[PDB]
Design a protein. Structure first.
Ligand SMILES: Cc1ccncc1-n1ccn(-c2cccc(Cl)c2)c1=O
Ligand SMILES: Cc1ccncc1-n1ccn(-c2cccc(Cl)c2)c1=O
Lengths: 304, 304
């Protein structure tokens, strides 16, 4: 019993972190096999931050200008290339600690763990969701660029995020491991609209099922609703519209608890319309949307 | 910017986790040097759970009855001893992945990371506080016993907790690494009073400083208070009395923000008396007490 915002064990990712320095900028890199991946803005100086011409900036750099250090040992760079917003530095040594891994592009509403790093050294690990507007609400300071987000399925690490930027609003933006930004963002020091965010409805319902499993049940009521009626409420409260695909993904939780998905939607409708009345659910005084239905099943069943 | 409930990177601890089986019970062990530490209740069966005679139960076991497996490899047990509520199994091989470590007894109100494990395999990592009543509100299922809590200072892991029990109330209890329970608990399947808990005042103040540093400032007011006046409010709201020692530990945060500790106490007094009025602080709709002043400084300065 108990339900916590749990991150994946970070060990397999810690063994991939390196420091990358180019000129006067230092950030983190991810060393997998004989390639080090890092944000391309490592080649920038302050003057070329408002609108860097990355192609021109990279043309002034040679393999020997990319200083890559894995703890105390220096890696020899034998190639460099830019793919979208990431640099790929080919090194002469494959990382002996490379885990089984994949590069994935996650969907908005999905969750992942972040290993925050500075100077190639791990600082901490936390779980978060990719917002529907493709930003993340992380904890990142200057020097954290190149820190990565990931999920782990048994012995395989699926890398889904690399940190690049803090928007002027204090929220974070980054790319997949092929250097493609999530959302409309560009790697420039400019104000950029993130767009309307919404609450991840399917996740809030999953967390309400986690609450019932762990004994917080005060929010269960005598009511039911329909997808149409619930979606009118979701529209009013800036929640993502619930679809049959979301209802289907909540199937295992509905089967485990015996609470029909539309019945849980009626409880969520009442909490949206009436608030929590000074009460808490799983130690939270707001409706939590950073646990997917898969997260709830995993945590409630002890998957390792 | 951004503030998250961050856990320490778990890698150094993952390399110490082993599975321990005795008879029909399997739980986790911590392999440091040539010793494996695990909860002594691994030697129990269901019949002897209400009140086990651990001395008698252990007398029926020999070194060869303790099956210790580190991933796929079996460790040879050459000795066994019970120290308080923990068993120490001496093995013939020192763990090659033993980090620099210490065993510490943490104080109530201090925080630590937990690496939840099942069958010797890491499942997830989360940060929590040792409650003032010496319980933890964790996320643990059957099989998680032997999972440990720790802090990391550079390359040294300070192990402070080993999980033993879930009380009938769903909260958790465990020991230091010498097998001494935190709190009044005993390792028996019996209802046990945990005692009145309180909110960790110094931590809530630290988190309010973290909020101001990250831009959430709506709760700052034109008022001040005294330790005496604030403590009358803390008494009414079941908060720990604030002392000069707590004020002194908040010194760095008060210096960084320019907000006098008693001025922040006046903001906390107003939030206690008036509530949040439907607003949030660092994404929370309640007053958070799981960040120590040290945690706030570390996260706000990027310590690795
Ligand atoms: C200062 C900071 C804090 C947290 N995460 C990231 C940062 N951070 C460090 C550099 N950049 C940056 C901003 C815009 C464009 C480009 Cl190419 C880089 C940034 O946002
Ligand atoms: C079932 C469970 C779930 C989460 N954490 C722990 C457990 N859990 C597994 C065994 N015990 C136990 C209870 C009382 C006394 C003793 Cl010696 C052992 C327990 O509490």
């Amino acid at each position: 019993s108990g339900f916590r915002k749990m991150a994946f064990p970070s060990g397999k990712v810690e063994g991939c972190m390196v420091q990358v320095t180019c000129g006067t900028t230092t950030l983190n890199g991810l060393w997998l096999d004989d390639v080090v991946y890092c944000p391309r803005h490592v080649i920038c100086t302050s003057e070329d931050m408002l609108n860097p011409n990355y192609e021109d900036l990279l043309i002034r750099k040679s393999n020997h200008n990319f200083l890559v250090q894995a703890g105390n040992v220096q890696l020899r760079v034998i190639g460099h290339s830019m793919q979208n917003c990431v640099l790929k530095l080919k090194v002469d040594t494959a990382n002996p600690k490379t885990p089984k891994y994949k590069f994935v592009r996650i969907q908005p509403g999905q969750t992942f763990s972040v290993l925050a790093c500075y100077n190639g050294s791990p600082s901490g690990v936390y779980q978060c969701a990719m917002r529907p507007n493709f930003t993340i609400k992380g904890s990142f300071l200057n020097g954290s660029c190149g820190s990565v987000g990931f999920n782990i399925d048994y012995d395989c690490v699926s890398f889904c995020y690399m940190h690049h930027m803090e928007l002027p609003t204090g929220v974070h933006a980054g790319t997949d491991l092929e250097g493609n930004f999530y959302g409309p963002f560009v790697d420039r020091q400019t104000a950029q609209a993130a767009g309307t965010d919404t609450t991840i409805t399917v996740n809030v319902l999953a967390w309400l099922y986690a609450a019932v499993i762990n004994g917080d049940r005060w929010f269960l009521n005598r009511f039911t609703t329909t997808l149409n009626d619930f979606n009118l409420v979701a529209m009013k409260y800036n929640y993502e519209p619930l679809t049959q695909d979301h209802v289907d993904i909540l199937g295992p939780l509905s089967a485990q608890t015996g609470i029909a998905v539309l019945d849980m939607c009626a409880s969520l409708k009442e909490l949206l319309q009436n608030g929590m009345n000074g009460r808490t659910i799983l130690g939270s005084a707001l409706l939590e949307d950073e646990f997917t239905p898969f997260d709830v099943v995993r945590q409630c069943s002890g998957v390792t």
